[PDB]
Symmetry: C2
Subunit: 364 residues, 2 copies
Amino acid sequence: GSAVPFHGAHQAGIATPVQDRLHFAAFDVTTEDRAAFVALLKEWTAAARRLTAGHAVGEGAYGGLPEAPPDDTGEALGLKPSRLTLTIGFGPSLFTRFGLADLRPEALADLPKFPGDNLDRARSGGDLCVQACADDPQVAVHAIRNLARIGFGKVVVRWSQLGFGKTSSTTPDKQTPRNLLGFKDGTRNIAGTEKDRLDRFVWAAEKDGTPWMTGGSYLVARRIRMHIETWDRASLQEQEDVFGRDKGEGAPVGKAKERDEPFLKAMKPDAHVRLAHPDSNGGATLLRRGYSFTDGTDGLGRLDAGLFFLAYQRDIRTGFVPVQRNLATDALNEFIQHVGSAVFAVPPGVRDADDWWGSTLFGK
Amino acid sequence: AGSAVPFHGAHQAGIATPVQDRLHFAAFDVTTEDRAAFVALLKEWTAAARRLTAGHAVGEGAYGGLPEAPPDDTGEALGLKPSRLTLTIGFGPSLFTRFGLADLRPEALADLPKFPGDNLDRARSGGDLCVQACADDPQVAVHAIRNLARIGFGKVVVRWSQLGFGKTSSTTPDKQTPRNLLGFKDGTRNIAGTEKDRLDRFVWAAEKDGTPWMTGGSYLVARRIRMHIETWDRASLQEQEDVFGRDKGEGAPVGKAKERDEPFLKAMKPDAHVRLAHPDSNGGATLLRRGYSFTDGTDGLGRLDAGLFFLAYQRDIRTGFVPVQRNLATDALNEFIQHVGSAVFAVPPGVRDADDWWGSTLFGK
Ligand code: HEM
Ligand code: HEM
């Protein structure tokens, strides 16, 4: 497939097929005028309509008046849409502006402090987020970079994160991707094909108390480093004890195939799978849509790499929070450290060529 | 199709090879003083490079070993294709201050002069040796550097690394020329992998140059260049085009109509980037540029921080990067870029067969 439809009852980039690359970015609002903001959201929408179809924003990247800066920076010229999806989310701090306090959804709870947290405030939070996912990373980077240029004067970029998963051009789509620890990551997850589960664990409903979120979701972002050098020193058995599956095939303890249903009582008490399993959390279930990241080498010469964890849910208090809390005694905690965090209320979708991002929240 | 690039040859792969879509560059610093210990590491690295470039796990594998033993391969590449992985090794001038290699530091491995406008981070510059990991799959390149580093534990350390999310170079003039983050095509007039007479003239060293052990190798100049994205995106279309000498949409030289139409340099502004970099403007000095675009989060001040990891292979740095870089002192592009990291490496000749090993010509075999 080449492109994903931008319009719909929901926003693309949540339930849709997971793309290869990612450029996440959290924005901070720098304007007080609500009409100027609404105007940006419409300009941003019009630009995303062009970005997700492989076209240049505005009037184009060249050919215009020579004395005028081009509307598009043009580093996407000659590339394909690449399954580009642009998902916008509203964070708690946004609702303290424009008189939106009383409309902040109660499902957008602030995350509590979890044991072991070492969050970098500079790389945390944000008034807005754009999740740019595509098979080609330059198409993602081009979209964030142009969306930031468009909104310059009304929004800035708080933090940005590049990620990567599979290379679909060479990796089969049905092959589970492996995280940087060497384990198949994503076996037991909510797929976008399961409309009944999405209606129960991901999408927000009107009765949930916030009508303007009817059709939207709530996103949780966690930047989790991995102690690559120590993990590579643990024995194969220790490694498999941590998760409760075997590294080669990814199968649960006592089973032969990856996708067999696990038998938790055979896993060690502090195994990752055993604790994060829904049965172990009053039925809490998540849609994990994260990416691996590798930013380079830190001061101490260690690999600055990990998982950019993303999770979509119908309510943050019945999704990420119960599950993350249960991971207090995770044996994986020895080899990981959360260092970035933010949450967002992702509104419903752009219904047609007249609608615009956040039209249910800001009205018409 | 994720096919593999042959690891053996008279030269190392990753130079004249078609530019791959991802990069993981890593400079190392030698910790051990034992010359026999380092030579052994070189033979261990070479063995792992044969496995990785072929799409196989290093050592005895990623699993199946003793449950009490750590796996030889970290396993994050299992189930992936070679993805055109290349691993190119280089020796830095600081490596010759040890193991008794002083008399073998190649004269062509010239230490760069101080260029005006530079603000080089010394912690992200230099290095006793380098390993260039290029591939169409980023998890493959990373998996390669990580496992090479783990094998060299106790004998080498990573000084700095640099990941390239996208190529800004081309050794294949027949394929689409990629674009840097300034929106312009980058790699139009560059040495192609099929142009042997030019590769022999500008890239591959020779025993006549004075360093026999470097016959068949090349010399690398790495330069981390930050881009002032904010000031560039304020310029007009005509200013951006006057900066380089080519138009933006087609990439043709000024006045012309097609990207690969040869330039008429007198029609460009006297400070046009193309006009000063052209070989005709540098006594015929020609480079083999093989760089990648990079992103580094945000400057912490509300702005995306991005740039270009510039790599240049040449037969002799004194006649390649140095003269061309000096001619860009007046370059109009200088008002939008800044060089913030730098390193040079003497890339030895390639691994001939399964009995050879990286740096065998230098260290004797
Ligand atoms: C670096 C950090 C992490 C790593 C390496 C990791 C890795 C894994 C692996 C290998 C599995 C088994 C394969 C699979 O079922 O997908 C798994 C399962 C799972 N993980 Fe994680 N995980 C991390 C963090 C988290 C966090 C922070 C959460 C939630 C707050 C989470 C929630 C889950 C869930 C819900 C499952 C499904 C288990 C089941 O239902 O059987 N993970 N993870
Ligand atoms: C951020 C820094 C740079 C950018 C954005 C940049 C961009 C470009 C562009 C757009 C072209 C024209 C298309 C092409 O011929 O590929 C070009 C050509 C060229 N550049 Fe640069 N460049 C940069 C740095 C450098 C440096 C540091 C050197 C050498 C020390 C260099 C040497 C050359 C050469 C030799 C050419 C080909 C000129 C010819 O047509 O003969 N560039 N570059």
